[PDB]
């Protein structure tokens, strides 16, 4: 009746041709206009198998996001093996917009609607769509921001939970705001993120309880990342064109799982390691004024130590294909022709 198959998917967006914001500039020319009445058809009585970990939709979104970043970011200096590239580095307008992934003729996208679907296995409530939901291509580590939520319980996704090297995606069912500010005026690189600790620790506590169901009720303990690059030992993200790096030691507080505002210390860095591929880039010092991003934390990226009565987890991230997975897990492409 249909065949699993891969094809070249295109993107669609509500990008504006008059916007100087870089995602708009990219998407107006990478992606078609969104269709104003998207049809979704329930496949009555169908059970279908899915696998979020072998889904070429993720690879294609990855290529587009790299394309977007390669066009849009203007580092003063780009260092890659045998190459120092120098150019002008004016400040840009930067704020992610959603994009949708869509099939050409002959293919359709199947969507798993089982609320507690973990990403692999049979799905009992399947529909066909022309395009995904709108996904913001937000590039971050540790916390997944401005994404979709799980509809019922908190979900744990891993390619293989027993393999301590495989990243665990936690999909939250209630978001918690994180508010990051480099205030106006004066260590210009000093910033911070505020999180309501009551709301956060309640959610973290539910996360701990859910992980307990997968690890035979053992004590769940969080520890800071064990080492590596700053982009992944910190919660890193781009806020208005600036590269923020936020220390998350206090976010993952085992005593709390308090009450008050949690304040994470952040720094805006100019010399960064590039997520798109090998090498480093240098940017200009931060723009003047109040730099602020208020984001919804909708997911968490973790690794488990593995290798007694406890399991130890540490904030993860860096493989930006895990970011796309957290939103594409419910979709797969099939061939009808």
């Amino acid at each position, epitope marked *: 009746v249909w065949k699993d198959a891969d094809t*070249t998917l*295109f*993107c*669609a967006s509500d*990008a504006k*041709a008059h916007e100087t914001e870089v995602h708009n*500039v*990219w998407a*107006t*020319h*990478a*992606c*078609v*206009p969104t*269709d*104003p*009445n998207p049809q979704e058809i329930h496949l009555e009585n169908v059970t279908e198998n899915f696998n979020m970990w072998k889904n070429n939709m993720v690879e*294609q979104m990855q*290529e*587009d996001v790299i*394309s977007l970043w390669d*066009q849009s970011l203007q580092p003063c200096v780009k260092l890659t093996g045998g190459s120092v590239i120098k150019q002008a580095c004016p400040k840009i307008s930067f704020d992610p917009i959603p994009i949708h992934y*869509c099939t*050409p*003729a002959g293919y359709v996208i199947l969507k798993c609607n089982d609320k507690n679907f973990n990403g692999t296995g049979p799905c009992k409530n399947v529909s066909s769509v*022309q395009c995904t939901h709108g996904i913001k291509p937000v590039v971050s580590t540790q916390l997944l921001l401005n994404g979709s939520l799980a509809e019922e319980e908190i979900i744990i996704r891993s390619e293989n939970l027993t393999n301590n090297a495989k990243t665990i995606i936690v999909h939250l069912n209630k978001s918690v705001e994180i508010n990051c500010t480099r205030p106006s005026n004066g260590d210009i690189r000093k910033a911070y993120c505020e999180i309501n600790g009551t709301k956060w620790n309640k959610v973290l506590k539910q996360v701990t309880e859910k992980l307990k169901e997968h690890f035979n009720n053992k004590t769940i303990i969080f520890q800071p990342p064990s080492g590596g690059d700053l982009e992944i030992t910190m919660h890193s993200f781009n806020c208005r064109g600036e590269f923020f790096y936020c220390n998350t030691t206090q976010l993952f507080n085992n005593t709390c799982i308090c009450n008050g505002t949690i304040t994470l210390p952040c720094k805006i860095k100019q010399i960064i390691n590039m997520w798109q591929g090998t090498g480093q880039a240098m940017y200009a010092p931060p723009i003047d004024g109040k730099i602020n991003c208020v984001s919804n934390i909708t997911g968490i990226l973790l690794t488990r130590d593995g290798g007694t009565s406890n399991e130890t987890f540490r904030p993860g991230g860096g493989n930006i294909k895990d970011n796309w997975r957290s939103e594409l897990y419910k979709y797969k492409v099939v061939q009808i022709e």
Partner: antibody
Amino acid sequence: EVQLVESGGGLVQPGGSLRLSCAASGFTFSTYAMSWVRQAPGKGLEWVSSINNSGRNTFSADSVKGRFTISRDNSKNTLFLVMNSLRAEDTAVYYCAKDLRLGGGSDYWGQGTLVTVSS
Amino acid sequence: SALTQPASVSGSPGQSITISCTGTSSDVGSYNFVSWYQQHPGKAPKLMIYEVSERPSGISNRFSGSKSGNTASLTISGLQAEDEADYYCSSYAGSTTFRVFGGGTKLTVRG
């Protein structure tokens, strides 16, 4: 200012092939969607194909599906149209066009290249 | 043609004339991506109006575009001799048909 110059047209037998090239200058080629639009002698405009900025995605008219392929080389500022299995009804001036947006209208058009399919 | 335009329209200098372009609810009716092009003999098309009613820089404000339902319209006020040319409408049409054009309108300026 934008310039677009088409080459590679000419005379070709029915069933034959051609490759059209468009040389782009005056703008940052790699950031724009591009299209080919044709016009048979004495007749109206017909969209043929379009390509997004990176070239990862292409779109073609049903009348040319499976015969024509659009592509681009962003390192060389060139747009191509590979055309196979040509027929008389493909005879036309083929214009290269720079697009306002993918799927949108084309704010700059080359002078076109005539393609004549005949023995 | 997928969009329908009158084959011919005429006017006198200084008159206002309007060229219709009728499509369907999956093209003109679904988006605001209608463009109009002017084509003089032997020359490439020139964009006059895009996104229904926007004008590129350097195009006379005598040219304006509008839409109602599945019908777009190009209006040319204070008609001049040099407006005598062929005019084509065009729309996005969804992700498979993509872009559709009208059959064209030959505009003549009498006097």
